[PDB]
């Protein structure tokens, strides 16, 4: 049943790369059910079941599969395989919120990569590890700042390495997450610098999602830099791409952000305009949360210029929610 296993796994690989993990999983599970005498093939199968379930957002199953892969990788003495499973287990543990163990695992990926003189693996491990420390500081105080600073150092180290490797997409990932870590630590200038680099690279790849993200993140930093007009301008950009990308949830998000910025700029006509557009998009998406916050936002703006009744209208409207 080895060839049949090989064959079934090929279907699964195709389907997952094809963008549909649901069917691929079933074919991998079929391959497992058929079995094989080649443990490196099973390893590969386990690893791909783990990544698919991870991407399918079943983390418990992703954890089990990567754990089996890790164990088997050791059993057969496959070092690169062990490093990989270890990194995958690490990332999964991070999502589940075991940070201590996630660190241990991602460190393993890093340490083995170095023994193997594998620079690609090493850099990737540094980024994953940075992500763990970032999540640790975010989820939570001295330990918080310490974790966030660890993430910065780790991103800086990754960037140094992927610069040598000429890996632009890796730079893009690390710049964005570095920027957001600076942002949490309260270094806004540094956050801006990082996201600016992330934006250049998103434009370079033609990636509109990443481009929108950078714009959003830059807008946020300029808010805390006390420069409101500049933030509103970056939000203006996110609005455009949101329409461009045909993402309504993001479009609404853009509108809300612009609403609050113009509130700080103390221009309440534009504020109302965008809060109105948010209100509309929110209902459209059947979002009760945003709806109320939109009603609340509108109540305030109308109150700011002393519009009387119309403020009360959204008041009640918000009260209901």
């Amino acid at each position: 049943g080895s060839a049949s296993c090989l064959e079934l796994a090929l279907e699964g690989e195709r389907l997952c790369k094809s963008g549909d993990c649901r069917a691929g999983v079933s074919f991998f599970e079929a391959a497992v059910q058929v079995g094989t005498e080649d443990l490196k093939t099973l390893s590969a199968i386990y690893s791909q079941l783990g990544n698919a379930y991870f991407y399918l957002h079943d983390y418990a199953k992703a954890l089990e599969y990567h754990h089996h892969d890790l164990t088997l990788a050791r059993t057969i003495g496959d070092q690169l395989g062990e490093a990989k499973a270890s990194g995958n287990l690490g990332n999964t543990l991070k999502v589940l919120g075991n940070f201590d163990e996630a660190i241990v695992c991602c460190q393993r990926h890093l340490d083995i990569s170095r023994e193997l003189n594998d620079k690609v693996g090493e850099a990737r491990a540094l980024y994953n590890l940075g992500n763990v420390y970032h999540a640790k500081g975010k989820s939570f105080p001295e330990d918080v700042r310490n974790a966030l600073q660890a993430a910065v150092d780790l991103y800086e180290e990754n960037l140094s390495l992927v610069t040598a490797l000429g890996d632009r997409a890796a730079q893009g990932r690390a710049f964005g997450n570095l920027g957001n870590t600076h942002y949490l630590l309260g270094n806004f200038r540094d956050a801006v610098i990082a996201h600016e680099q992330r934006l250049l690279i998103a434009k370079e790849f033609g990636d509109k999602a990443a481009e929108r993200r950078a714009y959003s993140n830059l807008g946020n930093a300029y808010i805390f830099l006390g420069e409101f007009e500049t933030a509103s301008e970056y939000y203006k950009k996110t609005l455009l791409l949101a329409r461009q990308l045909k993402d309504r949830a993001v479009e609404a998000q853009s509108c809300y952000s612009l609403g609050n910025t113009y509130t700080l700029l103390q221009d309440y006509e534009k504020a109302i305009d965008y809060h109105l557009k948010h209100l509309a998009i929110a209902q459209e998406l059947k979002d009760r949360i945003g709806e109320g916050r939109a009603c609340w936002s509108l109540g305030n703006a109308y109150t700011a210029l002393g519009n009387h009744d119309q403020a009360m209208h959204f008041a009640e409207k918000h009260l209901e929610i």
């Binding site: 090989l6 796994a9 090929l10 690989e13 093939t41 390893s43 590969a44 199968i45 690893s47 791909q48 990544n51 991870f54 892969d69 395989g81 490093a83 990989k84 499973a85 990194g87 995958n88 990332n91 991070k94 990926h109 693996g121 990737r124 980024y127 994953n128 992500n131 893009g172 990932r173 690390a174 964005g176 997450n177 957001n180 942002y183 949490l184 992330r198 990443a210 929108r212 993200r213 950078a214 959003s216 993140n217 946020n220 998000q253």
Partner: peptide
């Protein structure tokens, strides 16, 4: 809302070109 970059995962295949 902080917009994060995604994780990477390590991948294996049953075939090596």
């Amino acid at each position: 809302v902080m917009e994060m970059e995604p994780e990477t995962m390590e991948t294996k295949s049953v075939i090596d070109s």
